[PDB]
Design a protein around this nucleic acid. Sequence first.
RNA 1: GGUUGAAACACGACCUGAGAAA
Lengths: 215, 225
Amino acid sequence: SDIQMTQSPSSLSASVGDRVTITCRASQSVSSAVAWYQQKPGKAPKLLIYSASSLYSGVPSRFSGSRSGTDFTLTISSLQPEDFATYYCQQSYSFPSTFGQGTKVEIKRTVAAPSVFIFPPSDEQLKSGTASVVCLLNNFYPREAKVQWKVDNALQSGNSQESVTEQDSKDSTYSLSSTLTLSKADYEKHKVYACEVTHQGLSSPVTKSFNRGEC
Amino acid sequence: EVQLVESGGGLVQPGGSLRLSCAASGFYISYSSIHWVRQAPGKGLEWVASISPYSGSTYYADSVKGRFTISADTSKNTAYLQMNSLRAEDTAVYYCARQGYRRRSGRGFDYWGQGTLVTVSSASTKGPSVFPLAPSSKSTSGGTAALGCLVKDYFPEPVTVSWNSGALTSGVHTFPAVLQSSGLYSLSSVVTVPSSSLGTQTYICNVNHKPSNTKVDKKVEPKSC
RNA sequence: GGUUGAAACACGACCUGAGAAA
């Protein structure tokens, strides 16, 4: 039975200057052979704390680790705009080494309403036999949002895919794209193509729509 | 400067073999423990294997024991990860990490490489079809317009999208790839620009899918209506 | 076992200990 590292919470949204605490509980004794890492999206992890409580060279002193038996905590005293990433704990007391599931720290900002855009499929794509209708939600917060596709007032389900960006580095907002995919035979049997968007930053759902060939 | 450079990744069939390399510079691997740590797309780090500096002792995660073999060539200052009997579960970005010096960093991994992407699938490579997301507004609407490109039906990851040959970087949003039901990836890359820029500014999306050796530049223009 | 030697095991040294402890 190898060692487990239960990291909690899996994610948290905090503001600049906040005091955040990430905890890791080892399923058995790992002494103090626990390390903490910081990983930016698309980049390699960076060593922050080694030996449970020792600060790695070059890491600012706002990061700190502590041990309480089998409980290990990573603490950022005052959150900085560059401290927002995913943090991992790792035990190296015995092989196999194991990492915690990670904790993504995102910046909490004020609520922002999404700017909604609808795009009809280009003339080139129906020549290929497939139609993709894209609905864009640009620069909103928080990330949670409801995107519904309605064609001739008929609700769609199971034929659209959603994709959300990471939190933007400038305005700390999210962007969402919903792509309704239909065949040319199914695309031309309908007229109205509407994208309904519901978000807490909006007083009511916003609807961007178009018709086939309506300019 | 102390650095680790992974290589040897790519697309491989399930059950096939792949040998990853980790070229080290600025230090000698013979005095350090070298570890392999992978990260499946959108998940956390998972320790894979390690090799001890002076004894050559090797250790492996339970999910890779017997299939994987880690080794080091001190004369080449390079570590290796021989991967055999590859499964779809092995699809991940593979990092090689130097375990720091004991007195200076305990057992923490003080240096990581950029990582190499390993994709285990029987799916064939396929270049993407790029379709334009034409802006609806006009050059004189007085607002901000939104345009983009639809990078559809490609395999495997990754694909890169730039606008106006990297000259346009403000307001661009390149969404993460989503795996469609057909098994091919698809994503959109959009950008918000002033409506007054239409006509004075041209907008070219540059799509580069290196695994399939496809480079496509699609011109996104206001639709002729 | 601990500490260390660029060093989790193996190896060298040191420490504890009847013994580094199969």
